[PDB]
Design a protein around this ligand. Structure first.
Ligand SMILES: [Mg+2]
Ligand SMILES: [Mg+2]
Lengths: 1126, 339
C-alpha cells in the first residue's frame, strides 16, 4: 500500500493501543488526547462489559457448561478491530519488516505480506473434536467430554505473554500484550428477489495478539463487521438479515502442551472403546492432548451458538471453521444449504470471423431497451446508446451489420443509413444481450476477428467434488489451455483440387426435410454464408439425408479442414483465384508441408485431451469458429445456496441460487514451481502490493539481483514476475520492504525440501475484472427482458460434480471405472455423494472418504441434515446429476483436468433440450452401466449410472472439436476395455466403500433422522437391501426419489411446518428484541438514526405473514427445516 | 547459447555501386533477413535409426593422409567434439578419403540435418538415451511430421536466396553453428579515403583507409509504407525528438487518435511507432507540437499518390551504439597486439 495509507493505519492503531493503555510507537496529539482520556475513563467505569455478540456467547457457555469444574469467561477487555486494514498493520512490526514467534514467521514484502505458520499443512486425522452435551456427534468425529471442553476453553484464555505479544510492537522497548477481537457477518442464505432476504450469522474471533495475522486472513475473506459494541453492528437489532446464530472462534496454539491427565481424562484401562478410538485417554502421565497432533474442539447445540477453539494457527483452519459454522447455521436455519462447491455463469462464445449481421428476435428491440433504462443510457444521434455507469458497454440497434475489415457497425435509423466505428475495447450489446467485440489472436496481433458471446448463461455448479476432482476448474477460463499448431498437408495441390471440387458441389438438396431443399443457393465462399455455416454445411447431421451424410463421411479430414481454412481467410478481393493464396514453402529445394496463407504459416487452435502412455500430449484441433466461453465465477469453496420457486414465477419449477461467502480465494498454486506454467498465479503473486501470502520462502534484495542475472530461470517467468524481479533488484539496501516472494520458490522446509502447500489470497475474478462482470449482468438482464437496475440472480442450470480417479498401486486401490462424463439418477448419485471416495488416504476397507458431500471434515453436525436438504434440492428441482472424471479414465488413460476444462464448454454449447437426460437416454446418447459376471462374482457396475457414448461425443463435442470422433478412444469411452480385472476391482472398491460409509450412519444412529429416500439408500449401501427388501432396482424404492412423491409426503410437509415454525420464532424474538431496546429511555437517539421505529413495524408485518397459511404455501418447493435434530 | 565473434575484422568496401546495387546493404545486419521454420521428417523413427547408425560409425579412418587415421576417437556426441566439428565431420572434404567422401555423399540430407540437430541439443545428462527426446506430435490421432525436442517444436534458421518464377521464396537452412556477423559501419554515401603503406609497417603492402564525411545519414525508408517491415526506420522516426524529416505527410493530433483505434494498421507497426501514436493521441489540442510524422505516411502529392522519396537524417549506427563500437575497437586492437 501507499506510504500514506500505511501511516493512516498506524495512526488508527496508535489511537486504539493508547485507549487500552498499551505501549505504542511515538510518531495534533494535543488535539485527540482529551478525547482519549475521556474515553478511557468511560471505559473503566463500564470495564468488563461484554458486547451484544459476546453476551450471546457467554450466556451459552455459562449455561452449556453449568455442570463442570470450570466456567470459562470470555476476555472482557480486547483490542477491537473495528475497521478493515488494522489487522494488516498490526500483523507486522511498525518499524521492521520481519517478525518471529514460536508459531509464525512474518515478513513485509514488496508484493504483499508473507506469513509462514508453525505447520505448513492442514491435517484431518483426529483434528475435529466435538464436546458432548449438545447435538449428536458423527461417527467419524472425536468425542470430547463436556467437562474436558470446559478445562480446555478455560486454559485457552490463559495464554502466555509470548502469544499475547502484538507483532506491531515486537521491536519496541516495551511490547504490547493483549487479546484481539474481530466481528464478521458471513453469508448463510443468499438474496433471491421476492423469495429470501440475504441473511448472515455473526462470528466473533477472539485471539491473542500473537495471532494477528490470522485476523487479517479471515477479515479479508469474510469482511469486517465493525465495533460490536455499537447498535448498528448488533445482529439481533436487524433480525431480518440475521440467521439468529452466533459463532465464536478462539485460536490458542499454546493448548498443544496440555496433558491428558491434567485435563482429567481417564486412563486407557478405564476408558471406553470410543475414548480409546479417539485418543481421549492417557497411558503415561506426560501424554499430550490429542497425542500432540493439531486439533480444534467445538461445542454447539440447537440454540444456535457454536464455540470453537483451534489449537493451530495454519490459516486453512480459520476459513474452514467459518465454513463449518456457516453449515451449522444453514442446518439450523432451514431452507438453506452450505456447499463445498465451485461454479460459474458460462456464456458460450464463437469466432464470427470478419462480417456478422445481427439476428435479434422480434421480441427484443433497442427502443424497448432505451425506454426501460433511459436514466442509464446516453442516447446518441446515430440511433445507439451508451451505458452511462460503464461507457464501454454500447447498445447497438437490432439487425445491425458488424464488419471487422472496414471496422464499422452500420444500420438504418431516422430514415438514413448510419455508420459508427467498431472500436476495440467496447462491448457492443444487441437488444437481446448478444455481445460483439473485436479481438486479435493470441499468436498474431495483426489477425483480427469478431467474437460473438451469447447472453444466455449456462450456469454450472460443481458440488461434492473431492480434492483433485477439479472444483476450481469449473470457473477457470480455457484460453490459457490453448495449444497452437500449424496447418499440414501431404500434398496441397491435390488437396486444393478436392476442395475446389467440394466448392462446386450442389449443396441445396442436402436436407432430410425435403421441403428445405432447393432454398439455400449460397456458394461456399459467399459473403452471405458464414464460417459457421460452412462448418455445419460439411458436418454430418440428422438434418441431412442419408446420401448427403454419406457424401460427407467420404470427405477426407484434411480436405475438410483445408476447406474451412480457405473459408476462414477468403477475401472477396481475391475474386475466384483463391488457389494462389495458399501454398507450401520450398525449403532447400524441397517442397514443405506447412500450408501458408500469402507466405505466412497458418496458425491453428488445439486443446489437449489426455496423455498417451508414452507421455505425449493428445492434441485435437478446434473448429475455426470456436472461442473460449466467458466464465463469470460464482463459487469456489464456501457456497451459500437456497432452493425456491423461480423468483420470476411463483408457479415455476424450483431452482437453486448460490452466492460465494468468500471475497478472497485461498489459492494453492501447485505448479507455480514450473516457471511460466501457471500464468494466473504468477500474475497474482507479482502484480500486487497487498497480497496475503503463506508458505513461500522469504527472499532478499540480493537474491533478486542474482535471479535477474540468471538468464535461464529469469527468461522462463512470465512478464509480471520478470518485472517484479527487475524492481526488487534495483532496490538499494536502505529501501523497504526488505523481503519479497517469488512465485516459483515455496517455503523451505527444515528437512531439505520445500513446502507442497504454497498459498495466497486471490482477488476474486469478478472483482479483479469488474467491467466484464458488469457486461455479463447487463447482457444477462437483456436476455431476460429485465430492467438494468436491480438484483436479477440467475438460477443454476447444470450440476456437474467432479470426481478424482486413480489407477491401482501397491497400496492404492483401483478407482478408475468412470469414463469422461457420467449421468446418475438420484439414488446412484447419492451413493457417490455420501461416500465421496478418493484414492488419497485409503482405509482398510476399499478407498478413503471425504464424508457426505465432501463436507466430512467441515461439519460439526450429523451429515444427515445435509443429505435431507441435498436430496430435496435435486428432487424438487429436477436437477440432473452429472459426474465428470479427473486424473484417470481407467488404469491407463491419464487425462488430469483436461476433461474438467471441457465440461463447461460442452454444456454451454448445449441448449436446454440438448441437456435433457430423458431424451439423451432415449435417443441413444447415454448408455446405462450394466452388471456383468467376472470370475463367478457379479460386478455391480450398474451403480455408476449412465455414461456418454461416441454418439454423444460426435454430436456435442463436434460443436467444439474439428474431429470429435477421435477425441476419445474406445478405451476411454468404455474403460473396461483397458483391463477387465482392474475395472472389476474398481467397482468392488466402490461397493465396499459404499458399505463402510453408510454403516457409520447406523453406528451413531443418525440414520433414524434420514428421510425415507436417504434411509432406504443407506440400508442398501450398508446391508445389501432395505428394511422392505428393496434393492436399487426395486420400483418402490426409486419412486421415493421422484418429485411428486416427496411433494405429497408427510416428512416433507413436516420440514415445511418446521421451517414456518422456526421463522416465526426468530421474528417474534426479533420483535421482542426491538420493542425492549426502543423502550429503553437512553436509546431514543439511536432509534431515530437507525430508523428502528420503521424496522419494528416491518418485523411485526413479517411476523403476521410468516404465521399465515399464505407463507406456508410459498414454502412448497423449498428445502424446509430439519424437523428433529436427534 | 554462446556466440563467438572473431576479432579478425574483414573490412569490406563497396564503391562505384549504381542505384539499387546495394551500397548501404553491406553494413546492414543480416539478422533481420532471418526466416524461421521447423524441422520436418516424413518418418522420424526411420530417420533416427539412420542417425543412430551414423553415430555408431567408426570415423577414425576417414583422412586421406594415412598419418592422421587412428588418432581421433571422439564419438559424435562427445563433449570434446564441438557442433562445428560434427558438421565438418559429415561434410565431404579434400582431406577425407574417397572411401569416406563416397560414404558421406550417400547420407540423406534429411538424416544429415537430424544428426546435426541431435548434436545441437544433446545434453550429457541424457546419457545413452537421446531418441526419447526427439518425437513428432500427434494431431487428431494422426502422426505429425515436425520434429520436437521434449514436446516443443525445433526452430531452424533460414535465409532467402532469390524467388522462384512463381514468386515464392527460395528458402535455405543456415548451419546450426552460424550466427550473424557483427558489422561496424564505416561508410554510407560520402567517403574520404587514402592509400598509404600500412601505418604499422612502412615496408608492407599498401592499404586503403576510409572514414565517413557525414555525421548523419540521409536515409530513404522506401518500404516503411509497409507497416512493421522497416524496423530500423520505424524506430528512428518514432523514438526521437530532434529528427530532421523530409517528404512525409504532416499529421495532426486527431489523426493520431483515429489511428490509435484503427486496430488493423495500429497492430502492424513496431512497438516504437505504437508508443508514438499513444503519446500523440493523449495530447490535448492546446499542447504543442501541433504535428507529428508517422513512418508509413509519406508526403501526399497533389496528383493523388504519395511521395516515393521519403527522407530523414539518421544517427550513424556507430554513434547510436557506441558500446559495440568500443568493443570492436578494443577487440580489433587485441587481434593485432596493439595497445
Ligand atoms: Mg475446500
Ligand atoms: Mg548517393
Amino acid at each position: 500500500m501507499s506510504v500514506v495509507e500505511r501511516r493512516q493505519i498506524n495512526a488508527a492503531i496508535n489511537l486504539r493501543l493508547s485507549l487500552l493503555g498499551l505501549p505504542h510507537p511515538d510518531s495534533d496529539a494535543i488535539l485527540v488526547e482529551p478525547l482519549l482520556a475521556r474515553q478511557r475513563e468511560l471505559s473503566r467505569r463500564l470495564k468488563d462489559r461484554l458486547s451484544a455478540p459476546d453476551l450471546r456467547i457467554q450466556r451459552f457457555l455459562d449455561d452449556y457448561l453449568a455442570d463442570c469444574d470450570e466456567h470459562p469467561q470470555l476476555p472482557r477487555t480486547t483490542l477491537v478491530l473495528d475497521e478493515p486494514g488494522l489487522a494488516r498493520g498490526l500483523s507486522l512490526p511498525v518499524d521492521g519488516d520481519e517478525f518471529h514467534s514460536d508459531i509464525v514467521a512474518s515478513y513485509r514484502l514488496v508484493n504483499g505480506v508473507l506469513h509462514n505458520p508453525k505447520h505448513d499443512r492442514r491435517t484431518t486425522a483426529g483434528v475435529f473434536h466435538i464436546s458432548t452435551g449438545g447435538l449428536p456427534i458423527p461417527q467419524d468425529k472425536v468425542e470430547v467430554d463436556k467437562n474436558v471442553y470446559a478445562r480446555i476453553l478455560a486454559r485457552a484464555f490463559q495464554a502466555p505473554d509470548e502469544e499475547l505479544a502484538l507483532p506491531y510492537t515486537a521491536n519496541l522497548p516495551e511490547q504490547a500484550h493483549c487479546w484481539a477481537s474481530l466481528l464478521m457477518r458471513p453469508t448463510v442464505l443468499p438474496a433471491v428477489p421476492g423469495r429470501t432476504t440475504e441473511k448472515s450469522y455473526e462470528v466473533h474471533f477472539i485471539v491473542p495478539g500473537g495471532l494477528m495475522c490470522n485476523l487479517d486472513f479471515v477479515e479479508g475473506i469474510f469482511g469486517n463487521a465493525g465495533d460490536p459494541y455499537l447498535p448498528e453492528n448488533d445482529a439481533s437489532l436487524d433480525p431480518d438479515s440475521w440467521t439468529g446464530h452466533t459463532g465464536c472462534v478462539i485460536l490458542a496454539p499454546h493448548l498443544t502442551t496440555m496433558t491428558k491427565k491434567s485435563l482429567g481424562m481417564p486412563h486407557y484401562d478405564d476408558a471406553t472403546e470410543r475414548q480409546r478410538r479417539d485418543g481421549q485417554c492417557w497411558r503415561h502421565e506426560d501424554d499430550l492432548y490429542n497425542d500432540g497432533k493439531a486439533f480444534k474442539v467445538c461445542a454447539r447445540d440447537e440454540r444456535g451458538v457454536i464455540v470453537t477453539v483451534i489449537a493451530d494457527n495454519y490459516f486453512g483452519y480459520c476459513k474452514k471453521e467459518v465454513k463449518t459454522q456457516i453449515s451449522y447455521s444453514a442446518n439450523l436455519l432451514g431452507g438453506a444449504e452450505e456447499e463445498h462447491s465451485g461454479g460459474a455463469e458460462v456464456y458460450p462464445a464463437w469466432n464470427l470471423n470478419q462480417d456478422f449481421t445481427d439476428r435479434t428476435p422480434d421480441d427484443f428491440t433497442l427502443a424497448d431497451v432505451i425506454s426501460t433504462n433511459r436514466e442509464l443510457l446516453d442516447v446518441r444521434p446515430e440511433g445507439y446508446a451508451v451505458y452511462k455507469p460503464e461507457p464501454n458497454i454500447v447498445f447497438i440497434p437490432e439487425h445491425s451489420h458488424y464488419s471487422m475489415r472496414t471496422q464499422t457497425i452500420s444500420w438504418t435509423a431516422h430514415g438514413a443509413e448510419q455508420t459508427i466505428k467498431l472500436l476495440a475495447g467496447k462491448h457492443y450489446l444487441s437488444p437481446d444481450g448478444y455481445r460483439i467485440h473485436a479481438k486479435h489472436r493470441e499468436m498474431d496481433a495483426t489477425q483480427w476477428h469478431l467474437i460473438g458471446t451469447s447472453s444466455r448463461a449456462v450456469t454450472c455448479h460443481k458440488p461434492a467434488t473431492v480434492s483433485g476432482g477439479g472444483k476450481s476448474e469449473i470457473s477457470k477460463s480455457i484460453s490459457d489451455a490453448f495449444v497452437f499448431g500449424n496447418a499440414f498437408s501431404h500434398d496441397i495441390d491435390s488437396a486444393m483440387d478436392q476442395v475446389q471440387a467440394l466448392f462446386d458441389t450442389d449443396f441445396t438438396n442436402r436436407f432430410a426435410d425435403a421441403s428445405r431443399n432447393g432454398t439455400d443457393h449460397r456458394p461456399v465462399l459467399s459473403i452471405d454464408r458464414s464460417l459457421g455455416s460452412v462448418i455445419k454445411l460439411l458436418t454430418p447431421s440428422i438434418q441431412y439425408n442419408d446420401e448427403y451424410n454419406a457424401f460427407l463421411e467420404g470427405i477426407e479430414p484434411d480436405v475438410k479442414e483445408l476447406a474451412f481454412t480457405v473459408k476462414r481467410y477468403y477475401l472477396p478481393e481475391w475474386g475466384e483465384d483463391w488457389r494462389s493464396h495458399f501454398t507450401v514453402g520450398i525449403m532447400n529445394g524441397r517442397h514443405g508441408n506447412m500450408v501458408r496463407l500469402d507466405g505466412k504459416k497458418i496458425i491453428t487452435n488445439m486443446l489437449r485431451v489426455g496423455f498417451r502412455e508414452d507421455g505425449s500430449w493428445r492434441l485435437f484441433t478446434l473448429r475455426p469458429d470456436y472461442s473460449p466461453a466467458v466464465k463469470v465465477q460464482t463459487e469456489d469453496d464456501i457456497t451459500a445456496s437456497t432452493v425456491t420457486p423461480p423468483w420470476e414465477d411463483a408457479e415455476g419449477l424450483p431452482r437453486k441460487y448460490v452466492t460465494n461467502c468468500e471475497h478472497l480465494l485461498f489459492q494453492r498454486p501447485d505448479d507455480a514451481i514450473h516457471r511460466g506454467y501457471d500464468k494466473q498465479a504468477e500474475f497474482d503473486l507479482a502484480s500486487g502490493t497487498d497480497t496475503f501470502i503463506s508458505n513461500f520462502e522469504p527472499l532478499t534484495h540480493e537474491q533478486a539481483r542474482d535471479l535477474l542475472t540468471d538468464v535461464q530461470a529469469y527468461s522462463e517467468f512470465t512478464k509480471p514476475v520478470r518485472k517484479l524481479i527487475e524492481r526488487v533488484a534495483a532496490m538499494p539496501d536502505d529501501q523497504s520492504p526488505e523481503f519479497w516472494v517469488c512465485s516459483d520458490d515455496p517455503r523451505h522446509l527444515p528437512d531439505g525440501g520445500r513446502s507442497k502447500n504454497p498459498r495466497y489470497l486471490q482477488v476474486r475474478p469478478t472483482d479483479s475484472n469488474p467491467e466484464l462482470t458488469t457486461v455479463a449482468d447487463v447482457a444477462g438482464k437483456l436476455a431476460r427482458k429485465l430492467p438494468l437496475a436491480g438484483h436479477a440472480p440467475q438460477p443454476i442450470d447444470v450440476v456437474a460434480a467432479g470426481r478424482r480417479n486413480n489407477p491401482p498401486e501397491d497400496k492404492v486401490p483401483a478407482l478408475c471405472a468412470y469414463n469422461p462424463l457420467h449421468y446418475m439418477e438420484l439414488p446412484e448419485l447419492f451413493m457417490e455423494y455420501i461416500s465421496s471416495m478418493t484414492g488419497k488416504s485409503p482405509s482398510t476397507t476399499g478407498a478413503g472418504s471425504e464424508g457426505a458431500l465432501t463436507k466430512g471434515p467441515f461439519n460439526a453436525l450429523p451429515a444427515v441434515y445435509d443429505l435431507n436438504a441435498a436430496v430435496l434440492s435435486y428432487a424438487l428441482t429436477d436437477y440432473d446429476g452429472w459426474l465428470s472424471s479427473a486424473g484417470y479414465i481407467g488404469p491407463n488413460a491419464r487425462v488430469d483436468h483436461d476433461i474438467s476444462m471441457l465440461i463447461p464448454e460442452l454444456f454451454s454449447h448445449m441448449g436446454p433440450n440438448d441437456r435433457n437426460t430423458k431424451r439423451l437416454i432415449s435417443e441413444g446418447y447415454l448408455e446405462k452401466m450394466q452388471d456383468f459376471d467376472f470370475d463367478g462374482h457379479r460386478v455391480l457396475a450398474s451403480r455408476l449410472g449412465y455414461r456418454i457414448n461416441d454418439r454423444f461425443v460426435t454430436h456435442y463435442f463436434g460443436r467444439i472439436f474439428l474431429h470429435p470422433d477421435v477425441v476419445f478412444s474406445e478405451e476411454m469411452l468404455r474403460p473396461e476395455l483397458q483391463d477387465e480385472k482392474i475395472f472389476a476391482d474398481s467397482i468392488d472398491v466402490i461397493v465396499k466403500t459404499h458399505q463402510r460409509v453408510a454403516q457409520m450412519y447406523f453406528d451413531d444412529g443418525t440414520v433414524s433422522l434420514a428421510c425415507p429416500p436417504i434411509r432406504a439408500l443407506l440400508e442398501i449401501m450398508a446391508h445389501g437391501a432395505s428394511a422392505e427388501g428393496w434393492t436399487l432396482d426395486s420400483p418402490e424404492f426409486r419412486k421415493l426419489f421422484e418429485r411428486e412423491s416427496v411433494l405429497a409426503s408427510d416428512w416433507y410437509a413436516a420440514r415445511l411446518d418446521a421451517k414456518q415454525a422456526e421463522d416465526v420464532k426468530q421474528t417474534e424474538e426479533g420483535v421482542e428484541r426491538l420493542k425492549e431496546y426502543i423502550e429503553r429511555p437512553d436509546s431514543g437517539s439511536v432509534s431515530a438514526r437507525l430508523h428502528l421505529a420503521d424496522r419494528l413495524r416491518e418485523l411485526e408485518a413479517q411476523l403476521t405473514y410468516e404465521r399465515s397459511p399464505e407463507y406456508r404455501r410459498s414454502l412448497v418447493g423449498t428445502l424446509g427445516r430439519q424437523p428433529r435434530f436427534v
